[PDB]
Amino acid sequence: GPALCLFDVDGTLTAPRQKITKEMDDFLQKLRQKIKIGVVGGSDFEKVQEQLGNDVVEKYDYVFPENGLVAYKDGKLLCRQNIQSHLGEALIQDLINYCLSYIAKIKLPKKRGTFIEFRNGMLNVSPIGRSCSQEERIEFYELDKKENIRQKFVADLRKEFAGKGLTFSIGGQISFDVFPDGWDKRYCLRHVENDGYKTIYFFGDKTMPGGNDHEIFTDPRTMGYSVTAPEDTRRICELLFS
Amino acid sequence: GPALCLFDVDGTLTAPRQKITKEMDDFLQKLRQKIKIGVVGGSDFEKVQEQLGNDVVEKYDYVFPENGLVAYKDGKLLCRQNIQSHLGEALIQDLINYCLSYIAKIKLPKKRGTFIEFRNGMLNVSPIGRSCSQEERIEFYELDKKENIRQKFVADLRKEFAGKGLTFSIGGQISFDVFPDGWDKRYCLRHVENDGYKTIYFFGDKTMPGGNDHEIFTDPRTMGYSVTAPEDTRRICELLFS
Numbered sequence: 476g477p478a479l480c481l482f483d484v485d486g487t488l489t490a491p492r493q494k495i496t497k498e499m500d501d502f503l504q505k506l507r508q509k510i511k512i513g514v515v516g517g518s519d520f521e522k523v524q525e526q527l528g529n530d531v532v533e534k535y536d537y538v539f540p541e542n543g544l545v546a547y548k549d550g551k552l553l554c555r556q557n558i559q560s561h562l563g564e565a566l567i568q569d570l571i572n573y574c575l576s577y578i579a580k581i582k583l584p585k586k587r588g589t590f591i592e593f594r595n596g597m598l599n600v601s602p603i604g605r606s607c608s609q610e611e612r613i614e615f616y617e618l619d620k621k622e623n624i625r626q627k628f629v630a631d632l633r634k635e636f637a638g639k640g641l642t643f644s645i646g647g648q649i650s651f652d653v654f655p656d657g658w659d660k661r662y663c664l665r666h667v668e669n670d671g672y673k674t675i676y677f678f679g680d681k682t683m684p685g686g687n688d689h690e691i692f693t694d695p696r697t698m699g700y701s702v703t704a705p706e707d708t709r710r711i712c713e714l715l716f717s
Numbered sequence: 718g719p720a721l722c723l724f725d726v727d728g729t730l731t732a733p734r735q736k737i738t739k740e741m742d743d744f745l746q747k748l749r750q751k752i753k754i755g756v757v758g759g760s761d762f763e764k765v766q767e768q769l770g771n772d773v774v775e776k777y778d779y780v781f782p783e784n785g786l787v788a789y790k791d792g793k794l795l796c797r798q799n800i801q802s803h804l805g806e807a808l809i810q811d812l813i814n815y816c817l818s819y820i821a822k823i824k825l826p827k828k829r830g831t832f833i834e835f836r837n838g839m840l841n842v843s844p845i846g847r848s849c850s851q852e853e854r855i856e857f858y859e860l861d862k863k864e865n866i867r868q869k870f871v872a873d874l875r876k877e878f879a880g881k882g883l884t885f886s887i888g889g890q891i892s893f894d895v896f897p898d899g900w901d902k903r904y905c906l907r908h909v910e911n912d913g914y915k916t917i918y919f920f921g922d923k924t925m926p927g928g929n930d931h932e933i934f935t936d937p938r939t940m941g942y943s944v945t946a947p948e949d950t951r952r953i954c955e956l957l958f959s
């Protein structure tokens with residue numbers, strides 16, 4: 476039937492931490508005369524503007540910053556969501572409080588600031604604090620590997636919550652993420668599944684387990700295609716759609 | 718002997734929350750041919766630039782953002798000190814552990830992120846979180862006066878950290894500052910002290926007890942003058958140097 480193309484932005488339509496190239500933007504616009512297109516990224520709408528231009532809403536059929544928590548369709552905002560409204564202030568506080576209480580009891584060499592980073596689609600938690608220096612990150616990550624600090628504090632959170640529909644995911648060097656079950660890139664799919672697309676292609680570059688694009692790639696609702704770079708995305712699109 | 722003028726920024730050289738007027742800027746420079754001048758404010762270096770001009774450091778003999786924890790003299794940065802090194806890493810971790818445990822215990826309509834912001838010469842603490850939106854900021858502000866949330870917090874903090882050489886100051890809407898005794902605006906006198914000034918004049922619009930200019934005004938190293946606006950600062954300086 477009719478189809479949709481969904482692209483990760485960073486690493487797929489663009490080179491890592493680089494803006495789109497006029498040549499690729501033009502290919503995509505030519506491709507829209509053949510098929511509906513849309514983009515999905517973990518970054519806020521401001522960042523996505525930096526990456527694809529301030530006219531992005533008018534140039535793509537769908538735009539899904541924040542893994543879809545914000546959604547634009549045919550130039551209008553289709554929907555907007557945040558972790559606060561979903562989980563609720565009560566539950567959002569029970570979680571903050573426990574995290575705070577628990578971090579007060581961790582004996583560390585150092586503590587700094589921003590232990591809780593509130594993002595609209597997750598809560599970053601950092602025993603040391605994100606404001607640490609790079610040399611303090613390393614000191615902590617090494618200590619974590621011998622004492623397993625992050626792993627035990629997720630463990631105790633998975634016991635006390637998680638029946639509230641919460642996922643916990645250790646990542647990077649100093650923090651872990653608390654986000655509702657399924658609020659990875661798969662979230663965006665809810666805004667396009669009821670629009671009548673017999674097949675939804677998806678292109679991304681972190682397609683293997685761990686990556687930003689893994690969970691959406693493996694979803695049975697997508698025709699998943701891995702990519703290595705923008706040039707490769709044109710290559711594949713040229714072959715799929717002539 | 719030779720002398721130095723030190724000016725509070727907001728309200729003394731500028732109308733509150735506004736840039737300086739070109740009239741006032743060019744006056745100061747005419748004075749500078751008669752006297753070394755300097756400025757001091759609580760705000761980070763970038764904010765000072767926005768009030769006095771990008772090239773502040775070249776137009777003022779001394780420049781003291783963050784009450785002087787960051788300091789420029791004749792264009793170049795002076796030796797620096799941070800709260801971690803002064804108070805020690807145990808009192809920092811014991812003061813963070815306490816603040817964290819206490820926030821977890823506060824019942825509030827909303828809690829968000831960045832409850833402790835780790836600055837060069839202080840720690841904010843925001844019961845609600847500095848990442849809060851604007852609507853949430855006013856909410857906490859207008860509830861705080863009904864239930865004296867911050868006022869009550871600062872009080873218990875003083876009891877527990879009595880004698881530890883720390884000061885506390887509720888400022889603004891959502892937070893209070895914790896800083897070593899002596900790290901108000903009078904921190905900067907450490908730099909201009911000596912350097913052969915027989916008289917150090919100081920101007921400030923919040924001379925009254927509890928104001929950010931009080932302790933530097935009363936400090937005996939300074940010849941303090943209370944100001945009611947930029948145009949008044951002129952009157953006193955025109956009375957003194959003409």
Ligand SMILES: O=P([O-])(O)O[C@H]1O[C@H](COP(=O)(O)O)[C@@H](O)[C@H](O)[C@H]1O
Nearest residue numbers: 841886887888889890891892893894
């Ligand atoms: O309002 P906030 O929470 O951002 O607070 C801000 O302003 C306060 C005073 O500002 P003023 O004297 O102009 O009211 C400062 O003490 C505080 O460190 C700063 O973060």
Ligand SMILES: [Cl-]
Nearest residue numbers: 590591831832
């Ligand atoms: Cl925090």
Ligand SMILES: [Mg+2]
Nearest residue numbers: 483485486487
């Ligand atoms: Mg990518």
Ligand SMILES: [Mg+2]
Nearest residue numbers: 692694697699
């Ligand atoms: Mg698939």
Ligand SMILES: [Mg+2]
Nearest residue numbers: 725727728922
């Ligand atoms: Mg002032």
Ligand SMILES: [Mg+2]
Nearest residue numbers: 934935936939
């Ligand atoms: Mg004095």
